[PDB]
Short mmCIF file of all heavy atoms in Angstrom, two decimals:
data_model
loop_
_atom_site.label_atom_id
_atom_site.label_comp_id
_atom_site.label_asym_id
_atom_site.label_seq_id
_atom_site.Cartn_x
_atom_site.Cartn_y
_atom_site.Cartn_z
N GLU A 1 -4.93 9.66 3.48
CA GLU A 1 -5.53 9.08 2.28
C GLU A 1 -5.47 7.55 2.29
O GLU A 1 -6.47 6.89 1.98
CB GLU A 1 -4.82 9.60 1.04
CG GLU A 1 -5.44 9.15 -0.27
CD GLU A 1 -4.68 9.67 -1.47
OE1 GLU A 1 -3.57 9.15 -1.75
OE2 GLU A 1 -5.20 10.59 -2.13
N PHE A 2 -4.30 7.01 2.63
CA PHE A 2 -4.08 5.55 2.71
C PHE A 2 -5.01 4.88 3.73
O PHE A 2 -5.69 3.90 3.41
CB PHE A 2 -2.60 5.27 3.03
CG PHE A 2 -2.31 3.85 3.42
CD1 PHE A 2 -2.30 2.83 2.45
CD2 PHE A 2 -2.03 3.52 4.75
CE1 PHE A 2 -2.03 1.51 2.82
CE2 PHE A 2 -1.76 2.21 5.12
CZ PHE A 2 -1.76 1.20 4.15
N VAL A 3 -5.01 5.41 4.95
CA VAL A 3 -5.86 4.87 6.02
C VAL A 3 -7.35 4.91 5.63
O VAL A 3 -8.06 3.89 5.76
CB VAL A 3 -5.60 5.57 7.38
CG1 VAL A 3 -6.64 5.13 8.41
CG2 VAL A 3 -4.19 5.25 7.89
N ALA A 4 -7.82 6.06 5.14
CA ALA A 4 -9.21 6.16 4.68
C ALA A 4 -9.52 5.17 3.56
O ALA A 4 -10.57 4.51 3.59
CB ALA A 4 -9.56 7.58 4.25
N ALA A 5 -8.60 5.03 2.59
CA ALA A 5 -8.83 4.11 1.46
C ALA A 5 -8.88 2.66 1.94
O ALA A 5 -9.74 1.88 1.50
CB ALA A 5 -7.77 4.29 0.38
N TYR A 6 -7.96 2.31 2.84
CA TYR A 6 -7.87 0.96 3.36
C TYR A 6 -9.12 0.61 4.17
O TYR A 6 -9.70 -0.47 3.99
CB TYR A 6 -6.61 0.79 4.22
CG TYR A 6 -6.28 -0.65 4.58
CD1 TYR A 6 -5.35 -1.39 3.83
CD2 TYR A 6 -6.88 -1.27 5.68
CE1 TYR A 6 -5.03 -2.70 4.18
CE2 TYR A 6 -6.57 -2.57 6.03
CZ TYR A 6 -5.65 -3.28 5.28
OH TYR A 6 -5.35 -4.58 5.64
N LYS A 7 -9.52 1.53 5.06
CA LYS A 7 -10.74 1.36 5.85
C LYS A 7 -11.98 1.20 4.97
O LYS A 7 -12.84 0.35 5.25
CB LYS A 7 -10.93 2.53 6.81
CG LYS A 7 -9.98 2.48 8.00
CD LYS A 7 -10.16 3.68 8.93
CE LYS A 7 -11.51 3.66 9.63
NZ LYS A 7 -11.57 4.76 10.62
N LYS A 8 -12.07 1.99 3.90
CA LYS A 8 -13.21 1.94 2.98
C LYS A 8 -13.27 0.60 2.24
O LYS A 8 -14.35 0.06 2.02
CB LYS A 8 -13.19 3.10 1.97
CG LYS A 8 -14.47 3.19 1.15
CD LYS A 8 -14.57 4.48 0.36
CE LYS A 8 -15.95 4.59 -0.27
NZ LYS A 8 -16.06 5.77 -1.16
N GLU A 9 -12.10 0.09 1.85
CA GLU A 9 -12.09 -1.12 1.03
C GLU A 9 -12.22 -2.38 1.89
O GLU A 9 -12.92 -3.32 1.51
CB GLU A 9 -10.84 -1.15 0.14
CG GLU A 9 -10.64 -2.41 -0.69
CD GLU A 9 -11.58 -2.52 -1.88
OE1 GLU A 9 -12.26 -1.52 -2.21
OE2 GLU A 9 -11.63 -3.60 -2.49
N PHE A 10 -11.58 -2.40 3.06
CA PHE A 10 -11.48 -3.62 3.88
C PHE A 10 -12.24 -3.58 5.21
O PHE A 10 -12.38 -4.60 5.86
CB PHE A 10 -10.01 -3.97 4.10
CG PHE A 10 -9.23 -4.10 2.83
CD1 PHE A 10 -8.29 -3.14 2.48
CD2 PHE A 10 -9.46 -5.18 1.95
CE1 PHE A 10 -7.58 -3.25 1.29
CE2 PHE A 10 -8.76 -5.28 0.76
CZ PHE A 10 -7.82 -4.32 0.43
N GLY A 11 -12.71 -2.40 5.60
CA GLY A 11 -13.50 -2.26 6.82
C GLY A 11 -12.73 -2.38 8.12
O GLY A 11 -13.32 -2.66 9.16
N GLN A 12 -11.42 -2.17 8.08
CA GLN A 12 -10.56 -2.19 9.27
C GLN A 12 -9.36 -1.28 9.06
O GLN A 12 -9.00 -0.97 7.92
CB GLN A 12 -10.08 -3.60 9.59
CG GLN A 12 -9.90 -4.48 8.36
CD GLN A 12 -9.90 -5.96 8.66
OE1 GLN A 12 -9.07 -6.71 8.14
NE2 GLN A 12 -10.83 -6.41 9.49
N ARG A 13 -8.76 -0.87 10.16
CA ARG A 13 -7.56 -0.04 10.16
C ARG A 13 -6.34 -0.84 9.66
O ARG A 13 -6.17 -1.98 10.08
CB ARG A 13 -7.31 0.42 11.60
CG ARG A 13 -6.19 1.41 11.78
CD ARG A 13 -5.84 1.56 13.25
NE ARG A 13 -6.93 2.12 14.06
CZ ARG A 13 -6.80 2.47 15.34
NH1 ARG A 13 -5.62 2.33 15.94
NH2 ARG A 13 -7.83 2.98 16.02
N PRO A 14 -5.50 -0.25 8.78
CA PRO A 14 -4.25 -0.95 8.43
C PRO A 14 -3.24 -0.86 9.57
O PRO A 14 -3.17 0.17 10.26
CB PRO A 14 -3.73 -0.14 7.24
CG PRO A 14 -4.24 1.25 7.50
CD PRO A 14 -5.61 1.05 8.10
N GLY A 15 -2.46 -1.91 9.77
CA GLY A 15 -1.31 -1.85 10.68
C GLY A 15 0.02 -1.75 9.94
O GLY A 15 0.08 -1.58 8.72
N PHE A 16 1.10 -1.87 10.70
CA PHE A 16 2.44 -1.71 10.15
C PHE A 16 2.81 -2.80 9.12
O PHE A 16 3.63 -2.57 8.25
CB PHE A 16 3.47 -1.60 11.27
CG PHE A 16 3.66 -2.86 12.08
CD1 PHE A 16 4.66 -3.78 11.74
CD2 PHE A 16 2.90 -3.09 13.22
CE1 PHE A 16 4.86 -4.93 12.50
CE2 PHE A 16 3.09 -4.24 13.99
CZ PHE A 16 4.08 -5.16 13.64
N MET A 17 2.17 -3.96 9.20
CA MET A 17 2.40 -4.99 8.16
C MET A 17 1.77 -4.61 6.81
O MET A 17 2.36 -4.91 5.75
CB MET A 17 1.92 -6.37 8.62
CG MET A 17 2.77 -6.93 9.79
SD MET A 17 4.69 -6.97 9.31
CE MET A 17 5.25 -8.24 10.66
N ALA A 18 0.60 -3.95 6.85
CA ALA A 18 -0.03 -3.49 5.62
C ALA A 18 0.89 -2.52 4.87
O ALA A 18 1.04 -2.63 3.64
CB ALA A 18 -1.40 -2.84 5.88
N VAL A 19 1.53 -1.62 5.60
CA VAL A 19 2.41 -0.63 5.00
C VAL A 19 3.61 -1.29 4.33
O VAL A 19 4.01 -0.88 3.24
CB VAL A 19 2.86 0.40 6.04
CG1 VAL A 19 3.63 1.53 5.37
CG2 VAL A 19 1.65 0.95 6.76
N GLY A 20 4.15 -2.33 4.98
CA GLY A 20 5.26 -3.12 4.44
C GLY A 20 4.92 -3.68 3.07
O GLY A 20 5.73 -3.60 2.14
N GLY A 21 3.70 -4.23 2.95
CA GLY A 21 3.18 -4.72 1.67
C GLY A 21 2.96 -3.63 0.63
O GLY A 21 3.39 -3.75 -0.52
N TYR A 22 2.29 -2.55 1.04
CA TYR A 22 2.03 -1.41 0.17
C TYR A 22 3.32 -0.89 -0.47
O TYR A 22 3.40 -0.73 -1.70
CB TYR A 22 1.33 -0.32 0.98
CG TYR A 22 0.55 0.69 0.18
CD1 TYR A 22 -0.69 0.36 -0.38
CD2 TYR A 22 1.03 1.99 0.03
CE1 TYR A 22 -1.42 1.31 -1.09
CE2 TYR A 22 0.31 2.95 -0.67
CZ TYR A 22 -0.90 2.60 -1.23
OH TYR A 22 -1.60 3.55 -1.92
N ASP A 23 4.34 -0.67 0.35
CA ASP A 23 5.61 -0.15 -0.12
C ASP A 23 6.45 -1.17 -0.88
O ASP A 23 7.22 -0.81 -1.78
CB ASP A 23 6.38 0.44 1.06
CG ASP A 23 5.82 1.79 1.49
OD1 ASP A 23 5.61 2.65 0.59
OD2 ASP A 23 5.58 1.98 2.69
N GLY A 24 6.28 -2.45 -0.54
CA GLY A 24 6.95 -3.54 -1.26
C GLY A 24 6.49 -3.59 -2.71
O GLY A 24 7.31 -3.68 -3.64
N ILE A 25 5.17 -3.51 -2.91
CA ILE A 25 4.65 -3.55 -4.28
C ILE A 25 4.96 -2.26 -5.05
O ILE A 25 5.20 -2.30 -6.25
CB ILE A 25 3.16 -3.98 -4.36
CG1 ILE A 25 2.76 -4.31 -5.81
CG2 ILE A 25 2.24 -2.92 -3.74
CD1 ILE A 25 3.46 -5.52 -6.40
N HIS A 26 4.96 -1.12 -4.34
CA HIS A 26 5.38 0.16 -4.94
C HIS A 26 6.78 0.07 -5.48
O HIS A 26 7.07 0.53 -6.59
CB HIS A 26 5.29 1.29 -3.94
CG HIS A 26 5.66 2.64 -4.52
ND1 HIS A 26 4.86 3.30 -5.39
CD2 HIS A 26 6.78 3.43 -4.33
CE1 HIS A 26 5.44 4.47 -5.73
NE2 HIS A 26 6.62 4.55 -5.08
N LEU A 27 7.67 -0.51 -4.67
CA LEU A 27 9.05 -0.75 -5.08
C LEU A 27 9.17 -1.56 -6.38
O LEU A 27 9.94 -1.19 -7.26
CB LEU A 27 9.82 -1.44 -3.94
CG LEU A 27 11.31 -1.73 -4.16
CD1 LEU A 27 12.13 -0.45 -4.30
CD2 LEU A 27 11.81 -2.59 -3.01
N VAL A 28 8.39 -2.63 -6.50
CA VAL A 28 8.33 -3.43 -7.73
C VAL A 28 7.86 -2.60 -8.93
O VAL A 28 8.51 -2.60 -9.98
CB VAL A 28 7.46 -4.70 -7.55
CG1 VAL A 28 7.29 -5.44 -8.86
CG2 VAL A 28 8.06 -5.63 -6.50
N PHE A 29 6.75 -1.88 -8.79
CA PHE A 29 6.25 -1.01 -9.86
C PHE A 29 7.33 -0.01 -10.26
O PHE A 29 7.66 0.13 -11.45
CB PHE A 29 4.98 -0.25 -9.43
CG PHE A 29 3.69 -1.00 -9.64
CD1 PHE A 29 3.47 -2.25 -9.04
CD2 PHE A 29 2.66 -0.44 -10.40
CE1 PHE A 29 2.26 -2.92 -9.22
CE2 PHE A 29 1.46 -1.10 -10.58
CZ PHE A 29 1.26 -2.35 -9.99
N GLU A 30 7.90 0.69 -9.27
CA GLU A 30 8.85 1.76 -9.57
C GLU A 30 10.13 1.22 -10.22
O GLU A 30 10.67 1.84 -11.14
CB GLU A 30 9.16 2.61 -8.33
CG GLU A 30 8.01 3.51 -7.90
CD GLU A 30 7.52 4.45 -9.00
OE1 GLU A 30 8.33 5.24 -9.54
OE2 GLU A 30 6.30 4.43 -9.32
N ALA A 31 10.58 0.05 -9.75
CA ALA A 31 11.74 -0.62 -10.35
C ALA A 31 11.52 -0.90 -11.84
O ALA A 31 12.35 -0.55 -12.68
CB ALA A 31 12.08 -1.90 -9.60
N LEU A 32 10.39 -1.54 -12.14
CA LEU A 32 9.98 -1.81 -13.53
C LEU A 32 9.93 -0.57 -14.40
O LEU A 32 10.34 -0.60 -15.56
CB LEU A 32 8.61 -2.47 -13.55
CG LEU A 32 8.63 -3.99 -13.59
CD1 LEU A 32 7.31 -4.53 -13.09
CD2 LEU A 32 8.92 -4.47 -15.01
N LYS A 33 9.39 0.52 -13.83
CA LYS A 33 9.40 1.80 -14.51
C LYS A 33 10.83 2.24 -14.81
O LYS A 33 11.15 2.59 -15.95
CB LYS A 33 8.68 2.87 -13.69
CG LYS A 33 7.37 3.31 -14.32
CD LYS A 33 6.95 4.70 -13.85
CE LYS A 33 6.11 4.63 -12.58
NZ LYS A 33 5.76 5.99 -12.10
N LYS A 34 11.70 2.19 -13.80
CA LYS A 34 13.09 2.63 -13.93
C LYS A 34 13.89 1.81 -14.95
O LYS A 34 14.78 2.36 -15.61
CB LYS A 34 13.79 2.61 -12.57
CG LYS A 34 15.15 3.29 -12.55
CD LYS A 34 15.49 3.77 -11.15
CE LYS A 34 16.97 4.05 -10.95
NZ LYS A 34 17.28 4.21 -9.50
N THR A 35 13.59 0.52 -15.08
CA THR A 35 14.34 -0.35 -16.01
C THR A 35 13.77 -0.29 -17.42
O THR A 35 14.32 -0.89 -18.35
CB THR A 35 14.36 -1.84 -15.57
OG1 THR A 35 13.04 -2.41 -15.65
CG2 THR A 35 14.93 -2.01 -14.16
#
């Protein structure tokens, strides 16, 4: 789902740095939810 969504939006395959960002921002959202 992630790869297809990323390819559709940006026209290229995500690499391991993209995932670092994706999960970094998820962490922020989830932290805010938890607090």
Side-chain angles (χ1 to χ4, degrees):
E1 185 181 74
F2 168 74
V3 172
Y6 192 97
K7 286 178 67 174
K8 189 169 188 186
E9 175 74 11
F10 305 109
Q12 31 200 224
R13 186 192 296 187
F16 67 93
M17 293 304 199
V19 187
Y22 201 75
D23 284 312
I25 192 66
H26 182 72
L27 182 65
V28 174
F29 274 58
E30 288 304 303
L32 266 158
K33 249 203 272 177
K34 191 156 162 193
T35 67

